[PDB]
Amino acid sequence: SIHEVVALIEELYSPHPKHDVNQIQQSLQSIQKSEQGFHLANELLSDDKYSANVKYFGALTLTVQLNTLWNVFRSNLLYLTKFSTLYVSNPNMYGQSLIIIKKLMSNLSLIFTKINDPQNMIKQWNNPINTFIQLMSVADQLLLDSINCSLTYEQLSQFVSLSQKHNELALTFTEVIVEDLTKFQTKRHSMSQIHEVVHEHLYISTMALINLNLTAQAVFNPTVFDCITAWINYISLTRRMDLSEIFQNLIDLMYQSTEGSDGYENAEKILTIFGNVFANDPLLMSYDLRQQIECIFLGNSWMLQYMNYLVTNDFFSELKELAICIVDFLQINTLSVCNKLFTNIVQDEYIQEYIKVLLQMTNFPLTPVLQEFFSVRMVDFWLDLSDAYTNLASETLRPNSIELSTQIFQQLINIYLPKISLSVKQRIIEEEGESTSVNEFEDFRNAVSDLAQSLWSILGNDNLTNVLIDGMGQMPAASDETLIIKDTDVLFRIETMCFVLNTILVDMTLSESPWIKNIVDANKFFNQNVISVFQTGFQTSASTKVSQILKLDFVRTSTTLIGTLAGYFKQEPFQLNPYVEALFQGLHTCTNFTSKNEQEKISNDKLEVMVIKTVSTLCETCREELTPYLMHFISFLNTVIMPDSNVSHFTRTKLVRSIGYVVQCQVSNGPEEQAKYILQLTNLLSGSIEHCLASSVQLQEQQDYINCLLYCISELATSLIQPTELSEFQSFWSSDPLQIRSKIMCTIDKVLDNSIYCKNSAFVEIGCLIVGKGLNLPDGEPYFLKYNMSEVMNFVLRHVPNCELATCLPYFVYLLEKLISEFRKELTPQEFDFMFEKILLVYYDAYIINDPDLLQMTIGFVNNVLDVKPGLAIGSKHWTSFILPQFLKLIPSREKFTIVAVAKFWTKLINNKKYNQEELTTVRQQVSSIGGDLVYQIMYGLFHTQRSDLNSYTDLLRALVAKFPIEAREWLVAVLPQIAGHEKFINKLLITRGSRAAGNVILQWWLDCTTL
Amino acid sequence: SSLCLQRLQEERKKWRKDHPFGFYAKPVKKADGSMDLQKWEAGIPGKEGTNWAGGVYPITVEYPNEYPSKPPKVKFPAGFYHPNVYPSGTICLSILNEDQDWRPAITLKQIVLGVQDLLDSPNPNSPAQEPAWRSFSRNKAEYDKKVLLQAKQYSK
């Protein structure tokens, strides 16, 4: 059958095999490990005529050793035997035979991990490297015994390095052992002492071998670099292991590695090692070696020569790795530079040149992302330096601290401002298109924006903000009319200045500041240049995808800065007019146009959203200043609401919200002048709704149009609410002679009287939102849409029978809860019985009792009545007949929200503090009657339930025991035995507690009562 | 505590070094301009090709003193519309619940990717918001329209 085994092994690796690959694989997994699998593996490795894949399968079959103590020794002997076999066949001249070499190395590494774990005998290995060393010297089977645990010195170890493959095999063996010890330590932490064994024997041999490869020129092999990183990783996981001389000699090799000497290959690998150290465990390197790294990177200098070698050859990935390593190295040094700079606790001219070179490196020619990442990683460094300077003590500053800090950070501003220039993104989209480099450029801009937000606490307004304002306010960007810049250089400069100025001005308050009025009035072209950016970008024809995306970016930045300036517009109204006119000119250009080719419309919608967003912010803050523009806008809206427009329903809604924001502040001329606008908007919305419902029989388009106009009514109702920041309006809106509520209610009735709309959940939702807009508002607020009790009641009674009871009832019920909380003073238990009978009880037994949403809806309604006015629920005719029996049977319910609803119901019923003295006596009397069945339902649910619902009737039992401790024992001695004798134990232990630590007694009772 | 601040510093370094495109995160500033390491501001971009596309939804992350023994609390703005967002804004997510899949080793990157995945793939087992879950389950068209308008609402 050995011929059959070799047959299907070669069949598995054939290009197009027969029968099946999965089946011959399962059969190969079936031959092993069984008592002949081990002997098969030894015959597969000892036979030289087999293929390399078959021998690999032999070592893999050996790997299954998890199947007790004796077969491990019998395996390890043959592991080391076939080991020494192929490892002697390698060093002379074999080649490409090291695959099985690595697999056998992995098998021995697994053996070293398994044997040294906690669990005639067999002692510990302690040092497999030495054992491998003496195994290359060929009474025969007796040799492995004495060679294993004790071996030679360092001179013979260097003599082993007579060949290159010897050093390569030793580096790989130590590397695989270390990476496997790393994988085994990361998987599960039961090691704790094997690390000590590696520290006492393997660590010494590995350190001596690595240092021999680093110091000696002939013994040097690049594989040691990949081995060093492995050792460093394992050390980073445990903790004293020195590694100081290894880092020192790696620095010496990197400095000796030049273009002519090494071709910067060793320098690249050693820099990858240092980048790994600094990025993962930077504390692993001592202070002296980090000082040498500082003197090598910052200095003609060797570092400048390596950077020029990487730049001239167009190696952007290797330059990226270099920037990552240098930044991770510089981020750990902050307090020493900050102290020798800004705190006083020959060095000055040295640290001035130090910062000068660091700023020259911060600038760094070659545009970003596309080529370099130095500025991208340096942003986090400058953030740490800004926070470190801000975190410095007030009494510790240097005499020249503020001047040197201002100078350094202003040079930073002058360096990073051309870096984030939009010309870079233009060249990125030109060369690389829509790649991930654009996304990295957006993350770079967000990082520099946060850098400026942290730098403002140092530079102030005049050194950071006034530099941008005077840069863009004292010179016209467009001398010709229509504000066309015509110039690319100043356009990129002004887009950069608008972006930085916006992110700085968002953190301010333009109302409390008179400084903003002083700085803008000293700049004639400031507002003109901001509008020049908006109009230049908006009127830009999108030819390529690059010009389209840049157009969207310019519009985004402009609309955001305009949105940030509303406080200054309240402080300086006469500069507001050019903005409103320029905005509405662009706003009409992106509204009345229907040209779509083809995905351009998503850019039109993004522009239209940012414009209407800026309009919403301005109407939110500058309500008083915008009074004269109202009469033109309502007419333009009348032209937009036409069943043919380019606006989205969202833009229609936010437009109605903006007009309502301006209308809310028109309380000056009295309620009549403001009501002229309110009645005009009411007649326009209801007229267009009634026009659409009764003319073009409602289709999906008419449904979206009706939903849009209903949302417009909702935004208008929200916008007319007085912000939290006389009697004539109260009497007017209490009477509302213009019949605003009458027209709105009849319009909602006309929409909900249609069968295509009343059974839709969305229209019921927005209807109950609009009708319940005036509910729960602070009393005294002259709200226009404040509805009385009877109007909302007859409204719900009007549209509740003809609607869909499954999906549409909770909105009417939430509206009734709002009405109950509003009219809590004037409510009567008979009116509450009327609402309970008409809206819930008739529809209960058919549509509610078997529906979880409607069930939890009804329970939450009763809980709302108990929270607001308990006298309505207690004095109900269905209180003792319906509410109590039903909620009693619903205690061991299967729905989580239903369980929580019933538990909150009985909990509020017990712990309610709003009870009258008569109501409290009647409640205690009724509870002292049903309490029995209550404990039965509690233990019934607790028995049939499982974890995560145990704490539900715990708070119910906590309230029942605290409120009724005496009857608690009488009800427990009756309910416990039904749901054996050990149950009595909870009685003494629970009532003794009172409350606050039950459950702990309860699960200790459930544990008893479950096994039985 | 003191493990808490050391861990949050390491998290800040790790995030700032490597994170998904379109996210941002930064400690809020205290009155003295120093960072409140236990309260962060972040932004979650909607996934392209979903009704969430185009929005960047802002969240706050509040780390308890017992972090990382206890998970942070993550909140959207009050009134955010989603079936797994409480009225308060509290997100229902297994990795954010100490009683479920929270592990001390979970990083901010994993949290924010979890939130992104939750955005277009709500979990029915955590219905934190009645109207969102109801619309999702009974009027998908309304839910999608609301999501699209909220994406416009929080436009990038």
Author numbering:
A (entry chain A): 3 to 69, 78 to 129, 137 to 155, 162 to 262, 269 to 328, 343 to 388, 396 to 775, 786 to 1039, ...
B (entry chain B): 2 to 157
The authors write:
Diffracting Ubc9-bound Pdr6 crystals were obtained from a complex comprising full-length S. cerevisiae Ubc9 and Pdr6 proteins. Pdr6 binds Ubc9 in an open superhelix conformation. In the import complex, Pdr6 adopts an open conformation where the distance between the tip of HEAT 20 and the loop between HEATs 4 and 5 is ∼25 Å. Ubc9 is bound to the inner surface of the superhelix with HEATs 6–18 of Pdr6 engaging in extensive interactions with Ubc9. The first interaction interface is formed by residues of HEATs 6–9 and involves mostly salt bridges. Several aspartic acid residues of Pdr6 at this region (D370, D429, D433, D436, D492, and D499) form a negatively charged patch, shielding the conserved basic residues at the helix α1, as well as the following loop and two β-strands of Ubc9. The second set of interactions involves HEATs 11–18 of Pdr6. Helices α4 and α3 of Ubc9 pack against HEATs 12–15 and HEATs 16–17, respectively. Overall, Pdr6 buries 1,473 Å2 of the Ubc9 surface area. Our structure of the Ubc9•Pdr6 import complex revealed that Pdr6 is transporting Ubc9 in an inhibited state with blocked interaction sites for the E1 SUMO-activating enzyme with SUMO E3 ligases and SUMOylation substrates.
S. cerevisiae Pdr6/Kap122 was originally identified as a pleiotropic drug–resistance protein and subsequently as an importin β superfamily member. Furthermore, we found that Pdr6 imports Ubc9, exports eIF5A, and thus, combines functions of Imp13 and Xpo4. Pdr6 is an all α-helical protein built of 19 canonical HEAT repeats followed by three helices (termed HEAT 20) at its very C-terminal region. The transport signals recognized by Pdr6 are folded domains.
